[PDB]
């Protein structure tokens, strides 16, 4: 009764919202937050695709996606803690000296 198209469009909306939140923010924490939004949107799209076909594979890919999201959130917050404890500044544009 629910269209697959509507669930896919909802996942796409959340994905592009996470992408623009990733781009527009100088603070690294909001960049990590936008990354979490994008990966949650991708997992939602996999759930919609799996539930449309009546298959278990969508929830399995969802489980793999949230395992990835947990590990990436852990690593990114470790890197953010390192940046804050070595520079006392979460500005990502200051971490830019390698260029050319």
């Amino acid at each position: 009764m629910i269209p697959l198209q509507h669930g896919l469009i909802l996942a796409a909306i959340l994905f592009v919202l996470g992408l623009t939140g990733l781009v527009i923010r100088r603070n690294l924490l909001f960049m990590l937050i936008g990354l979490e939004i994008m990966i949650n949107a991708s997992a939602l799209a996999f759930v919609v695709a799996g539930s449309y076909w009546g298959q278990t594979d969508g929830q399995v890919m969802y489980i793999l996606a949230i395992s990835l999201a947990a590990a990436e959130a852990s690593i990114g917050l470790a890197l953010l803690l390192q940046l804050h404890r070595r520079r006392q500044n979460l500005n990502i544009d200051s971490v830019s000296e390698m260029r050319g």
Binding site: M1, I2, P3, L4, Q5, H6, G7, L8, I9, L10, A12, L14, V16, L17, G18, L19, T20, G21, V23, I24, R25, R26, N27, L29, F30, L32, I33, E36, I37, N40, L44, V47, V48, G50, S51, Y52, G54, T56, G58, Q59, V60, Y62, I63, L64, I66, S67, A70, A71, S74, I75, L77, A78, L79, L80, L81, Q82, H84, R85, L90, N91
Partner: protein
């Protein structure tokens, strides 16, 4: 089932929109938790009961707890509000809008017989996970071990 799906999708979209524009980190994380709860409600509308339970247990109950922990220990760019003035988000917003309109053009035009909403239980997901998905399970434990090792190596104080 359609009613809950549409309200939860709308709540998730609205909460994400408040997430990416807010200035306070704790408030943004609270809106993100609200969006995760809405996404779990969407999962329960589709019949993916295990996915909704996992969206509350693992995403809102573990990962956002980690983000909240980091924000509290930071005790925290905020003052100027760069992302609010249109001269900063003029480009990225229309770029994301163009990407979204191309994606939803691809979405419109596919075979769509509708979603039945029959519950795919966690028992069947377990049979699949521990049937034809042995290497996904073992290497996913392997991946989480890798993430644990990396995050301890980087995030410890000394």
């Amino acid at each position: 089932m359609e009613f809950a799906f549409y309200i939860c999708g709308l709540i998730a979209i609205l909460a994400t929109l408040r997430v990416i524009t807010h200035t306070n980190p704790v408030h943004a994380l609270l809106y993100l938790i609200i969006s995760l709860l809405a996404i779990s409600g969407v999962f329960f509308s589709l019949g993916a009961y295990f996915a909704g339970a996992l969206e509350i247990i693992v995403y809102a109950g573990a990962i956002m707890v980690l983000f909240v922990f980091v924000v509290m220990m930071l005790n925290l760019i905020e003052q100027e509000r760069q992302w609010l003035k249109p001269q900063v988000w003029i480009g990225p917003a229309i770029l994301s809008a163009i990407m979204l309109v191309v994606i939803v053009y691809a979405i419109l035009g596919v075979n769509d017989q509708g979603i039945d909403g029959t519950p795919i239980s966690a028992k069947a997901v377990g049979i699949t996970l521990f049937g034809p998905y042995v290497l996904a399970v073992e290497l996913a434990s392997m991946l989480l071990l890798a993430g644990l090792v990396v995050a301890f190596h980087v995030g410890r104080e000394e």
